[PDB]
Design a protein around this ligand. Structure first.
Ligand code: A1B8M
Lengths: 39, 156
């Protein structure tokens, strides 16, 4: 049995921590909703 | 129960203690999350109950109490924010420039941020605060890092 608890408002935060790269990946999506890398 | 708009944790008491299995968005009276978080099961919000309304394993999305309401899209140029809600930790915005998942059915934005699997369902936002997709379905690249698609549903 699952339940939900409020964790906050959905707002854009000015001056938030900026991290992470932008990779261009060739991918495939199967019937189970699972992605895989195309090579 | 609580129907106020906002980001929510999806918890369970089936395992040891209280375990966070995912996160979701409440908007216009509809709870939005990823399919693999709830498996389409009913949810509880205090004394109230949320029943599934729409779902799809391939898109990996599910809605409760009504149809999918989120329809904002990534503009393909700007930085976005992942409003990450990790297990046992406070909601925290992380800014990033998304990459691209090139598929046979078009391109989808993708965020390269690493979080515990229980962070699945955390919303990705544009500068206007609009939910452009949810985090938690993607791929693991060669070095072991995680890249999630910016998964968005369709508003009927
Ligand atoms: C821990 C790691 C790598 C990470 O850093 N973040 C995440 C976020 C999500 C998952 C995840 O496993 N998602 C998932 C599970 C099951 C199914 C689908 C997706 C869609 N078909 C069934 C993993 C991670």
């Amino acid at each position: 049995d699952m339940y939900i608890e409020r964790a906050g408002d959905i707002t854009w935060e000015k001056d938030a921590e900026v991290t992470g790269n932008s990779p261009r990946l060739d991918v495939a999506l199967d019937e189970s909703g699972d992605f895989s890398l195309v090579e | 129960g609580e129907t106020t708009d906002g980001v929510y944790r999806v918890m369970t008491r089936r395992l040891l203690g209280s375990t966070q299995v995912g996160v979701g968005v409440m908007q216009e009276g509809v709870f939005h999350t990823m399919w693999h978080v709830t498996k389409g099961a009913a949810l509880r919000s205090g004394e109230g109950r949320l029943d599934p309304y729409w779902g799809d394993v391939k898109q990996d999305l599910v809605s409760y109490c009504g149809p999918w309401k989120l329809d904002a899209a990534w503009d393909g140029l700007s930085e976005v924010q992942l409003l990450a809600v990790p297990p046992g930790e406070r909601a925290k915005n992380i800014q990033t420039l998304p990459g691209i998942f090139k598929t046979k059915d078009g391109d989808i934005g993708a965020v390269a941020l690493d979080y515990p699997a229980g962070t699945s369902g955390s919303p990705i936002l544009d500068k206007c605060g609009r939910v452009i997709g949810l985090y938690g379905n993607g791929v693991v690249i060669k070095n072991g890092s995680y890249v999630s698609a910016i998964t968005q549903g369709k508003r009927e």
